[PDB]
């Protein structure tokens, strides 16, 4: 809609103010910020870096709507059957008495 | 030497006669896939390193400067370390076609060379195989033509319940 | 007027009433095609493209063509 | 003065139009064409019989069988294929002769 | 150097086939190049006579094609299936018999879904041949 | 399998060659909004917002040559297939979308995350972003589906009504000479009225559907356009 | 210019000498550029050396900024002379075209040979070093000028149409400057009248916001190869570098008044590199001096005072306006006595045409009066 | 766009322009084919095919 | 049914059939013929464009180990849901 | 025989300038017209006064 202006360094709230799934991950819990997805989302929104949430989604949709959708449909592996036809590992070997051609030299 | 032109026929024939694919050939192809992924990873690492080296000083300051998304403390330390390491010495920071060439040509050369030599390696591996696929590869390199229906001509091994066709 | 969806265009007047009233009409200078000109039937005196060829004659010609198209096989049938 | 549409010939204008005016559209179209010819370019005989004929499949002459017969005859004659080989028949030539004498 | 990329590189003289081309342009321009011939996106002109002439011609040639090339296939299938299942069996009939059969097919086409169903459903007790007549 | 066929436009191509060997002005356009995107003066866009004009005009011409002329009996809509229309709309929509994405401006997608900071990010805003990303593709699919279904239904209805009219006209016109002629006359008048109404409705609906088909693409383009102000 | 067999023979004969001369020029220009780059890195402003980022306000796409990423080395005369700068610029053009050709060769292996034959048949994209005589050099310059004529009008029209359709000037002086900026070369444009257009367009579009199509047209008009164009920040960088060198040389000449002492051929080349003086115009020293002085005046006092040139888009338009020749008009006026629709005379007029002629002809007033009177009578009778 | 052109006031004027002459010929064909079908397909001597129950499109498409 | 049959192309002229194996092999022969000459080094972008993607796809096909059965692409009958063969 | 108009139109269209209306330029140029004699007298008087001062 309207033009977007990146926030200044002084307009960005501190990391400690961000909230996670349950509560802020302040001192003694900072390393949990890496694992909390909601805390990261809230931090990105606070830092005006909302694209980090939106860009991966849309692209993913495109990737499914364009290339992976048909790949799955035409080449995807369906559910296995109850009675499975495993490989006996007997096919392929040359017969006894066969004289293979020499390798290049 | 151009191994791809010879190997394309062999790959198509194997796909057509994949039934006689021994576990050894399957392992060979899995190793080829793994080496392709490894080559992609190393080429991407080289491209990222070249991009970072040629990046502008202000661009590096913006990327590896405040604010910190997590602000844990390790993030800031690592960013400051990398920024100091990059900005200490003088770096050739071209723009436009020059950066494109510098970042891409080495990456393309590395990836292509690795893939070509891995293709040669796979050709050698299939040559050393003692299966019907190896015999087909050797015959292809000898006569220059792909001999289809070879497995049934030389009576390659079949499951005990499917040997009736060979009964002649 | 209209003929199905085709409407006859009408020229908008350009003269005012005062100026119009001062105009002297002399149909002697008008072409013979347009005399006693009527906006509701301007082509009443228009010449025929072909002398003696009426619209009904063409309509009947088309009807006869349809009758031929539908009845010729009845008189001169052909095998598959 | 110079204008692409008025001065250049038709092939040149086509290349310019689809390279510097609508290149992404051309790329997408080529991608879609490749997909269509890679996944939507086959028709089984049963499908042809069901829907492949305007008024219905004329079973009274079976043109599909004639078409395949001509195909296989041409392939055999041109490629010099011995259809009596054991792999095609599953039995030796002598067994084939014995069967012929039997039946 | 081999071929020119410019339309200015002429291959013929300016007077080549001038007369026929002028006649063709006269045909094109007389009815179309008029103020009242305002097209809608180049497809729908403003001249009534263009519609009046083109609609009948389009319908005529489309109908001729449909009658002599498309519906003919259905008619031939009906004749073959109902009278032996083979082309020679149909040809064994006379032209008048074929005419009768084809006109019955036209009757069936006209009835479609709005007509009696005895034309294809055999009422019980009917003495006419059934589906297994030729089997 | 390779099928060789031809479109049903050869006569129309001939007419185009005959009547457009000389220049003519165009003043009436089905979708005029592709030319006037900006209505407030001093607003300008650095993006090639006028790139869609040529494609719009060509698509209008093609679809009008096909659909409008299809009302004529036995005229064939050669392109009337679901997946073919899907391919066309895929081409256009995805080409414009990839034009926006190749710009490599991620901030352009900030508006996908609906709502304000007050709303919960994970349980409200993220779900809304998911729904909108899905809604883009749904808009493409809806465009192509609508274009297909409108034509299919209209022509089915026309064929059925024409068959009924043929049946009654041929096999019940003798009632004019009979004592129940009034009923037949009433039915015939109703059939004529329905014929005229259906033709008018189809004529209008074809043009309107083309307008909507172009407007969906233009809306896709406009959703990602940003206008600067002159100073 | 179209290819020809004579030019093909010329370039084939001079192929290897041309390559050798190009290599020698490459060594010399590498030395010159090494000097210039060392001076820029040592004495350049912090923003210029660090390559400060300037992003667009709509899509935040980085592009060179005229104020920050362009710097005029006022003291470059100590290390590098004007002639060396001109040599570097010429070599930059030749090296760009040679690099594109070499890239094509490397990409396509031995399949570029017929394309090389097409290339050598035309002087548009061959280096200047391939000409070993005056006549060959004149033909090469003619080809370059032809390409400039072919390309510039499109760029000028793009700029003017976009601005006029999406914006209007603020004041009368800006209106006059804008209108006089895009006049044909047959008339002389006053730089003082035209300068305010630079600020107006800075208000509209700066060099940092230049669109990719306009950039392509400009690069075509500057004899800069455009295929593969790629992102707009590559040819944009080329343009920035070329105009930065040109501005440094211009400051040197203005300060030292070298153009007055400059000889006729060198002056013509100096104007040509600024896209001011086509060779096909056969200009004399007076006209060249007038154009050069007008260019310096357009740069303005601020250029000498602080090294700040006016908006680069407007500067490029102004200089390329000399290649915007008047639209051609050939044929005696007597040709206007002919008729164009004689072939229709045989068709005559139909009923509708006769009606229109009768109603709208010289008798139109009488017909209108009669029709209106009849309609009024009928309406009165109806009531 | 239906802006203008010759417009006959009534039937008798359709002969004042070649295009409308062709139009009225076509209309005559169109309207006169129906009576022809009435006469042909409601004829006394018209007989249904005896083998009509041997085969029909309904069994084929089913 | 009959009304549905009116939505078919009306100008079908000829139909040609060709096996995937045959024309794929012919295309491979043409590609080898054009990529064989010495003046096109294997490291050229053109050669890699020609060969690498095809090699990658074929390798992916060979490496495939699916627990389900994929019916033959070019069977005689693919309309029976209860008969993959 | 009016080459300037031709060239401008062709160039505008070839650069994606399809639109045929220019309200802003017309607004800038619509009120332009040759002056009357009295207006010329007033303008000349203004110029003479300016030159004098
Ligand atoms: C700029 C464009 C903008 C506009 C976009 C417009 C379009 C819209 C966008 C969306 C896309 C629409 C789709 C359109 C069609 C395009 C074509 C398509 O879809 O093809 C897919 C198509 C899918 O394949 P397929 O044909 O379906 O076959 C499937 C098989 O898997 C194929 O088998 P294969 O043999 O080919 O192998 C493929 C392989 C591909 O991958 C590989 O080959 C290996 C990896 C490659 C890496 C490449 C380099 C990355 C950077 C390296 C490091 C740099 C930094 C160095 C310095 C470090 C200092 C410390 O992938 C895999 O198989 C998966 C392997 C994953 C292993 C995971 C192991 C577990 C550990 C690691 C993960 C977990 C970590 C947790 C950490 C937790 C920490 C707390 O092709 C592929 O994806 C594979 C081939 C191409 C690979 C390209 C690799 C590079 C990708 C780009 C990376 C950089 C850009 C992204 C980041 C940007 C940030 C700003
Ligand atoms: C036959 C050959 C076939 C070749 C195929 C390969 C592709 C084509 C090759 C190249 C073709 C020539 C043209 C290329 C484009 C040129 C663009 C251009 O003009 O750039 C000018 C520009 C120079 O201008 P500048 O002013 O110096 O700097 C630009 C400004 O910063 C600009 O400032 P700004 O304001 O615009 O700043 C923004 C700028 C900032 O970016 C830059 O400009 C910086 C440079 C790029 C950085 C990219 C790396 C970012 C970090 C990646 C981290 C990945 C971690 C993954 C970890 C995985 C762990 C498991 O852009 C971005 O933010 C874009 C970031 C990239 C986003 C990528 C999104 C991908 C989505 C994927 C969706 C899913 C895919 C399918 C599924 C896959 C997975 C299953 O050039 C560059 O900066 C770099 C150019 C590099 C060119 C490409 C080199 C190609 C090398 C190929 C090697 C491999 C060959 C394989 C052959 C195979 C057999 C045939
Ligand atoms: C084995 C049996 C034979 C067949 C072999 C086939 C081999 C196939 C190989 C495998 C292919 C696989 C893929 C196939 C995919 C097909 C897809 C498809 O059909 O899509 C529908 C789609 C339908 O498109 P559309 O919307 O209908 O428009 C296309 C039209 O062509 C109209 O579009 P347009 O009007 O925009 O086109 C531009 C048009 C612009 O307008 C014009 O130029 C007007 C003329 C139009 C001509 C084209 C229309 C053809 C109409 C039907 C045929 C006309 C009569 C032929 C009579 C044959 C009698 C037996 O200009 C032209 O067409 C340029 C050519 C003009 C030729 C003029 C020749 C003059 C000769 C004068 C000689 C005088 C000698 C005097 C000697 C005096 C001595 C004293 O088809 C296409 O888009 C084209 C598909 C073609 C694919 C490539 C096929 C390979 C090439 C085969 C050539 C065979 C030549 C040998 C035949 C010998 C006789 C038997
Ligand atoms: C064998 C493998 C082959 C691989 C496949 C290759 C396929 C072909 C692709 C093209 C490859 C390059 C072709 C040769 C170009 C000539 C050299 C050059 O760069 O000229 C300078 C010139 C630089 O242009 P610029 O705009 O002035 O640069 C702005 C910078 O700010 C400039 O910075 P500045 O302002 O500070 O000024 C610096 C200037 C100051 O210097 C001067 O002024 C003195 C003159 C220096 C340049 C002289 C150039 C002479 C060119 C003609 C040569 C003779 C031709 C003879 C032909 C006939 C032979 C019979 O010096 C420079 O020009 C230095 C530029 C930076 C170096 C670029 C080279 C990097 C690659 C080479 C190293 C590779 C290492 C591999 C390691 C492997 C590890 C595993 O190059 C160009 O004109 C650009 C290339 C134009 C064609 C582009 C085509 C698309 C390219 C896409 C590539 C994507 C990645 C690759 C994958 C592709 C997949 C599709
Ligand atoms: C020994 C030498 C020294 C060593 C080597 C040194 C290095 C040399 C190489 C580098 C040279 C660079 C400079 C080159 C300059 C000249 C370029 C050029 O061509 O200029 C036009 C040049 C004339 O130039 P000019 O007269 O000087 O005018 C120049 C002006 O300034 C006009 O200028 P302009 O700017 O207006 O012209 C530009 C025009 C240039 O174009 C043209 O002018 C068109 C040229 C062709 C026109 C053909 C017309 C005739 C057609 C005939 C058809 C057949 C007829 C029937 C034949 C029957 C035979 C029996 O347009 C373009 O630039 C368009 C560019 C398009 C790029 C395409 C990129 C596609 C990318 C694909 C998408 C990828 C997306 C990413 C996907 C990523 C996926 C992961 O054209 C010609 O000479 C025409 C030649 C026609 C030859 C005959 C027809 C073709 C024969 C084919 C035979 C095939 C045999 C095998 C068949 C096998 C079948 C199985
Ligand atoms: C009525 C019907 C008539 C017939 C119609 C025929 C049917 C056509 C149907 C389809 C037509 C549309 C197709 C569109 C596709 C999509 C295009 C697209 O997305 O483009 C985006 C985009 C648009 O391009 P742009 O740079 O923005 O501007 C394009 C304008 O045209 C630039 O214009 P400008 O004015 O700005 O610049 C003018 C001038 C400016 O002057 C210069 O730039 C100086 C001279 C530069 C020379 C070239 C330097 C190249 C440097 C390296 C490039 C990267 C290489 C990558 C690695 C190699 C990959 C193969 O440049 C030129 O004069 C260029 C001359 C090029 C001549 C060649 C044109 C093609 C003719 C056919 C030859 C090939 C036939 C193969 C098939 C037959 C085989 C038997 O493309 C690129 O970024 C270009 C990438 C180029 C990569 C290399 C080519 C890849 C394609 C495969 C090549 C296969 C070669 C096979 C050799 C033989 C094997 C046996
Ligand atoms: C510029 C870089 C140059 C590198 C040169 C070589 C460096 C030295 C060898 C590197 C290590 C190679 O060792 C590599 O190990 C992996 C397992 O981890 C093996 O891979 C094997 O097991 C993995 C397990 O996931 C399977 O997916 C794969 O199919 C199978 O082949 C490779 O077959 C072997 O080659």
Please list every residue in chain E whose beta carbon sits closer than 8 Å to the beta carbon of residue G8: 1
User: Between the CA of residue G200 and those of B15, G172, I79, what are the distances in Å?
Assistant: 67, 12, 70
Distance (Å, whole) CA G225 – CA F150: 50
B abuts H (3+ Cβ pairs < 8 Å): no
- Number of other CB atoms surrounding residue C10 within 10 Å: 9
Beta bridge partners of E47: H4
Identify the H or E element spanning F15: helix F10-19
Beta bridge partners of F3: I15
Q: Best substitution site from G6, G118, G123, G127 to test ligand 5's pocket, by max atoms within 8 Å of Cβ? A: G118
Distance (Å, whole) CA G63 – CA B95: 11
Q: What are phi and psi of G123, to 5 degrees?
A: -90, 5
Distance (Å, whole) CA G44 – CA G38: 9
Please answer whether residues G197 and G172 qualify as being in contact, where contact means their C-beta atoms are separated by less than 8 angstroms.
Answer: no
F10 lines ligand 3 (CB under 6 A): no
The answer to whether F137 contacts A38, with C-beta atoms less than 8 Å apart, is: no
What single-letter DSSP state applies at residue E116? -
Q: Which chains touch J (3 or more CB pairs under 8 A)?
A: D, F, G
* Residues 6 or more apart in contact with residue H14 via CB below 8 angstroms: C55, C58, H8, H20, H21, H23, H24
- Of the CA atoms within 13 Å of residue D18, those in its CB half-sphere come to 11
Note if the bond before G228 is cis, omega within 30 degrees. Answer: yes
D34 lines ligand 6 (CB under 6 A): no
Pick from A55, G63, G55, A1: which is nearest to F226 by CA? A1
Using alpha carbons only, what angle is made at residue C38 by residues C35 and C41, rounded to the nearest 5 degrees?
A: 110
**Measured in angstroms, how far is the CA atom of residue E107 from the centroid of ligand 5?**
62
Distance (Å, whole) CA I1 – CA H59: 11
Q: Residue I47: exposed, middle, or buried by beta-carbon count in 10 A (0-12, 13-18, 19+)?
A: buried
Q: Which of D8, D54, D60 lies at the smallest CB-CB distance from E7?
A: D8
Beta bridge partners of I16: F2
Crossing angle for the helix pair B132-143 and B97-128, nearest 10 degrees?
110
- Number of other CB atoms surrounding residue A39 within 10 Å: 25
The answer to whether B26 contacts I32, with C-beta atoms less than 8 Å apart, is: no
Q: What are phi and psi of C66, to 5 degrees?
A: -65, -45
Q: What are phi and psi of D8, to 5 degrees?
A: -75, 155
Distance between F140 CA and the closest CA of chain A, angstroms: 11
Distance between G310 CA and the closest CA of chain D, angstroms: 29
Which residue of chain B has the CA closest to G226? B97
Which residue of chain E has the CA closest to D53? E73
Distance between F156 CA and the closest CA of chain I, angstroms: 7
B31 lines ligand 7 (CB under 6 A): yes
The answer to whether E73 contacts D6, with C-beta atoms less than 8 Å apart, is: no
The answer to whether F2 contacts I3, with C-beta atoms less than 8 Å apart, is: no
Two tokens at I10? 């009306």
Two tokens at E2? 């081999």
The answer to whether D1 contacts J13, with C-beta atoms less than 8 Å apart, is: no
Identify the three-state secondary structure at position J26.
helix
HEC string for I10-74 = CCEEEEECCCHHHHHHHHHHHHHHHHCCCCCCCCCHHHHHHHHHHHHHHHHHHHCCCCCCCCCCC
Which residue of chain H has the CA closest to F28? H1
Please answer whether residues I52 and B1 qualify as being in contact, where contact means their C-beta atoms are separated by less than 8 angstroms.
Answer: no
Distance (Å, whole) CA D20 – CA G227: 10
B41 lines ligand 1 (CB under 6 A): yes
Two tokens at A91? 């096919």
Two tokens at I7? 């939505």
Q: Residue G111: exposed, middle, or buried by beta-carbon count in 10 A (0-12, 13-18, 19+)?
A: middle
Indicate the Cα dihedral angle I2, I5, I7, I11, nearest 10°: -130
The answer to whether J19 contacts F36, with C-beta atoms less than 8 Å apart, is: yes
B143-160 burial by CB neighbour count: b if 16+ within 10 A, else e?
eeebeeebbbebbbbbee
A65 lines ligand 2 (CB under 6 A): no
Please list every residue in chain F whose beta carbon sits closer than 8 Å to the beta carbon of residue I6: 155, 159
CA–chain centroid gap for G113, Å, is 31
Beta bridge partners of H4: E47
J abuts I (3+ Cβ pairs < 8 Å): no
Pick from A15, A49, A47, A51: which is nearest to A34 by CA? A15
Could you please report the per-residue DSSP string of G279-341? GGGT--HHHHHHHHHHHHHHH-HHHHHHS----HHHHHHHHHGGG-PPPP--S-GGGGGS-S-
Q: Which chains touch C (3 or more CB pairs under 8 A)?
A: E, G, H
Which residue of chain D has the CA closest to B149? D87
The pairing of beta strand I12-16 with beta strand F2-5: antiparallel
Please answer whether residues E51 and H1 qualify as being in contact, where contact means their C-beta atoms are separated by less than 8 angstroms.
Answer: no
Please answer whether residues G15 and G126 qualify as being in contact, where contact means their C-beta atoms are separated by less than 8 angstroms.
Answer: no
Identify the three-state secondary structure at position G231.
coil
Beta bridge partners of C2: C7
User: Between the CA of residue A88 and those of A81, B162, C76, E25, J27, what are the distances in Å?
Assistant: 17, 12, 75, 79, 87
**Measured in angstroms, how far is the CA atom of residue G115 from the centroid of ligand 5?**
7
Please answer whether residues F186 and F6 qualify as being in contact, where contact means their C-beta atoms are separated by less than 8 angstroms.
Answer: no
The pairing of beta strand C6-7 with beta strand C2-3: antiparallel
User: Which-ligand-closest: CA of B59?
Assistant: 2
Largest Cα separation within chain A, whole Å, is 83
Q: Residue F203: exposed, middle, or buried by beta-carbon count in 10 A (0-12, 13-18, 19+)?
A: middle
């Amino acid at each position: 809609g309207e033009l977007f202006v990146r926030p200044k360094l002084e307009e960005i709230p501190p990391a400690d103010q961000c909230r996670g799934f349950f509560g802020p991950l302040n001192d003694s819990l900072k390393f949990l910020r890496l694992l909390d997805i909601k805390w990261m989302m809230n931090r990105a929104v606070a830092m005006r870096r909302e694209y980090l949430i939106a860009t991966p989604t849309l692209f993913t949709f495109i990737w499914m709507f364009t290339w992976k959708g048909a790949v799955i449909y035409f080449w995807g592996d369906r559910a296995p059957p109850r009675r499975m036809d495993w490989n006996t590992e007997e096919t392929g070997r040359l017969p006894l008495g066969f004289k293979p051609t020499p390798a290049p030299l | 030497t151009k191994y791809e032109l010879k190997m394309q026929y062999f790959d198509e024939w194997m796909i057509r006669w994949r039934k006689f694919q021994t576990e050894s050939d399957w392992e060979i192809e899995k190793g080829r896939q793994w080496w392709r992924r490894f080559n992609m990873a190393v080429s991407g690492a080289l491209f990222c390193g070249l991009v970072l080296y040629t990046s502008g000083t202000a661009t590096l300051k913006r990327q590896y400067g405040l604010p910190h998304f997590f602000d844990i403390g390790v993030d800031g330390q690592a960013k400051e370390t990398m920024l100091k390491t990059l900005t200490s010495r003088w770096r050739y920071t071209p723009q436009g076609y020059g950066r494109v060439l510098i970042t891409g040509v080495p990456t393309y050369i590395l990836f292509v060379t690795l893939e070509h030599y891995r293709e040669r390696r796979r050709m050698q591996q299939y040559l050393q195989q003692n299966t019907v696929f190896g015999e087909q590869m050797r015959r292809l390199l000898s006569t220059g033509k792909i001999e289809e229906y070879l497995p049934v001509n030389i009576k390659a091994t079949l499951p005990a319940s499917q040997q009736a066709i060979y009964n002649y | 007027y209209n003929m199905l969806v085709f409407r006859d265009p009408k020229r908008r007047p350009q003269l005012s009433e005062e100026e119009r009233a001062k105009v002297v009409v002399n149909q002697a200078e008008w072409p013979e095609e347009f005399k006693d000109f009527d906006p509701d039937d301007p082509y009443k005196n228009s010449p025929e493209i072909i002398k003696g060829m009426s619209s009904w004659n063409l309509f009947l010609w088309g009807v006869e063509c349809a009758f031929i198209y539908q009845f010729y096989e009845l008189v001169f049938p052909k095998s598959i | 003065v110079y204008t692409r549409w008025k001065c250049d010939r038709l092939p040149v204008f086509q290349l310019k139009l689809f390279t510097q005016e609508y290149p992404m559209h051309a790329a997408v179209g080529i991608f879609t064409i490749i997909f269509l010819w890679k996944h939507m370019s086959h028709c089984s005989e049963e499908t042809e019989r069901k829907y492949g004929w305007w008024a219905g499949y004329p079973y009274w002459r079976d043109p599909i069988a004639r078409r395949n017969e001509t195909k296989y005859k041409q392939m055999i004659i041109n490629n010099d294929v011995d259809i009596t080989h054991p792999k095609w028949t599953g039995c030796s030539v002598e067994q084939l002769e014995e069967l012929s004498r039997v039946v | 150097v081999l071929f020119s990329t410019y339309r200015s590189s002429r291959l013929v003289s300016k007077e080549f086939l001038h007369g026929p081309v002028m006649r063709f342009r006269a045909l094109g321009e007389y009815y179309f190049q008029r103020a009242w011939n305002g097209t809608l996106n180049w497809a729908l002109p403003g001249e009534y006579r263009l519609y009046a002439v083109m609609i009948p011609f389009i319908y005529f040639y489309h109908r001729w094609h449909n009658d002599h090339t498309l519906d003919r296939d259905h008619v031939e299938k009906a004749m073959i299936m109902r009278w032996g299942g083979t082309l020679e069996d149909v040809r064994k009939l006379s032209a008048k018999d074929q005419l009768r059969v084809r006109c019955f097919t036209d009757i069936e086409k006209l009835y479609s879904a709005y007509g009696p169903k005895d034309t294809y459903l055999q009422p019980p007790g009917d003495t006419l041949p059934g589906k297994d007549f030729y089997r | 399998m390779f099928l060789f066929f031809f479109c049903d436009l050869f006569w129309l191509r001939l007419l185009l060659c005959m009547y457009y060997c000389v220049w003519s002005r165009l003043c009436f356009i089905v979708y005029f909004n592709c030319l006037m995107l900006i209505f407030d003066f001093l607003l300008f866009c650095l993006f090639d917002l006028y790139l869609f004009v040529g494609l719009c005009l060509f698509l209008l011409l093609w679809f009008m040559l096909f659909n409008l002329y299809s009302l004529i009996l036995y005229y064939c809509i050669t392109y009337l297939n679901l997946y073919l229309l899907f391919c066309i709309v895929f081409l256009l929509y995805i080409a414009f979308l990839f034009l926006f994405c190749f710009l490599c401006d991620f901030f352009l997608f900030n508006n996908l995350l609906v709502g304000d900071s007050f709303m919960d990010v994970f349980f409200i805003r993220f779900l809304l972003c998911f729904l909108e990303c899905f809604s883009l593709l749904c808009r493409c699919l809806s465009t192509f589906l609508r274009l297909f279904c409108n034509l299919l239904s209209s022509h089915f209805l026309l064929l059925m009504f024409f068959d009924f009219f043929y049946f009654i006209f041929v096999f019940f016109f003798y009632g004019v000479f009979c004592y129940w002629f009034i009923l037949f006359i009433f039915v015939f008048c109703f059939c004529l009225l329905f014929y005229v109404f259906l033709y008018l409705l189809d004529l209008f609906a074809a043009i309107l559907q083309l307008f909507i088909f172009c407007n969906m693409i233009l809306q896709l383009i406009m959703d990602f356009l940003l206008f600067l102000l002159f100073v | 210019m179209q290819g020809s067999w004579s030019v093909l023979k010329k370039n084939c004969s001079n192929f290897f000498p041309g390559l050798l001369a190009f290599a020698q020029q490459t060594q010399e220009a590498y030395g010159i550029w090494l000097r210039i780059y060392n001076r820029q890195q040592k004495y350049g402003p912090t923003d210029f050396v660090e390559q400060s980022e300037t992003f667009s306000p709509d899509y935040h796409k980085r592009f060179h900024s005229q104020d920050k990423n362009m710097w005029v080395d006022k003291e470059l005369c100590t290390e590098v002379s004007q002639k060396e700068v001109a040599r570097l610029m010429t070599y930059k053009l030749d090296m760009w075209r040679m690099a594109h050709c070499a890239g094509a060769l490397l990409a396509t292996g031995g399949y570029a040979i017929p394309f090389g034959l097409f290339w050598l048949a035309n002087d548009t994209w061959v280096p200047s070093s391939f000409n070993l005589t005056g006549e060959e050099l004149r033909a090469w310059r003619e080809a370059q000028d032809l390409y400039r004529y072919r390309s510039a009008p499109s760029y000028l029209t793009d700029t003017k149409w976009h601005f006029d359709f999406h914006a209007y000037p603020w004041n009368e002086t800006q209106e006059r400057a804008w209108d006089d900026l895009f006049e044909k070369n047959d008339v002389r444009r006053d730089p003082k009248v035209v300068r305010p257009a630079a600020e107006m367009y800075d208000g509209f579009i700066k060099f940092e916001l230049i669109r990719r199509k306009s950039l392509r047209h400009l690069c075509r008009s500057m004899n800069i190869p455009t295929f593969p164009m790629l992102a707009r920040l590559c040819n944009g960088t080329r343009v920035r570098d070329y105009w930065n060198l040109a501005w440094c040389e211009d400051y040197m000449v203005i300060t030292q008044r070298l153009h007055e002492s400059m000889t006729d051929e060198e002056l013509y080349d100096y104007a040509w590199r600024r896209y001011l003086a086509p060779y096909d115009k056969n200009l004399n020293r007076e006209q060249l001096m007038e154009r050069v002085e007008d260019y310096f005046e357009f740069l303005g006092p601020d250029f000498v005072a602080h090294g700040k040139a006016p908006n680069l888009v407007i500067l490029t338009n102004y200089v390329l306006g000399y290649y915007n020749d008047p639209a051609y008009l050939e044929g005696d006026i007597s040709e206007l006595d002919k008729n164009d629709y004689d072939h229709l005379a045989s068709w005559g007029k139909d009923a509708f045409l006769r009606r229109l002629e009768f109603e709208n002809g010289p008798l139109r007033d009488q017909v209108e009066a009669h029709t209106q009177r009849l309609l009024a009578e009928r309406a009165a009778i109806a009531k | 766009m239906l802006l203008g052109g010759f417009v006959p006031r009534r039937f008798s004027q359709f002969n004042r322009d070649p295009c409308w002459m062709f139009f009225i010929f076509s209309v005559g064909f169109w309207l006169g084919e129906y009576p022809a079908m009435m006469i042909k397909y409601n004829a006394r001597d018209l007989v249904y095919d005896p083998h009509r129950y041997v085969w029909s499109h309904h069994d084929d498409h089913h | 049914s009959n009304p549905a049959d009116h939505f078919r192309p009306n100008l079908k002229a000829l139909t040609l059939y060709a096996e995937r194996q045959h024309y794929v092999d012919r295309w491979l022969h043409v590609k080898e013929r054009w990529l064989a000459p010495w003046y096109l080094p294997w490291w050229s972008p053109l050669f890699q464009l020609g060969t690498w993607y095809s090699q990658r796809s074929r390798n992916l096909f060979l490496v495939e180990n699916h627990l389900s059965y994929r019916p033959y692409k070019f069977r005689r009958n693919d309309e029976d849901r209860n008969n993959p063969y | 025989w009016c080459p300037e108009v031709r060239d401008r139109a062709e160039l505008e269209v070839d650069i994606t300038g399809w639109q045929w209306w220019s309200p802003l330029e017309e607004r800038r140029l619509l009120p332009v017209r040759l002056r009357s004699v009295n207006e010329v007298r007033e303008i000349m008087s203004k110029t003479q006064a300016k030159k004098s001062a």
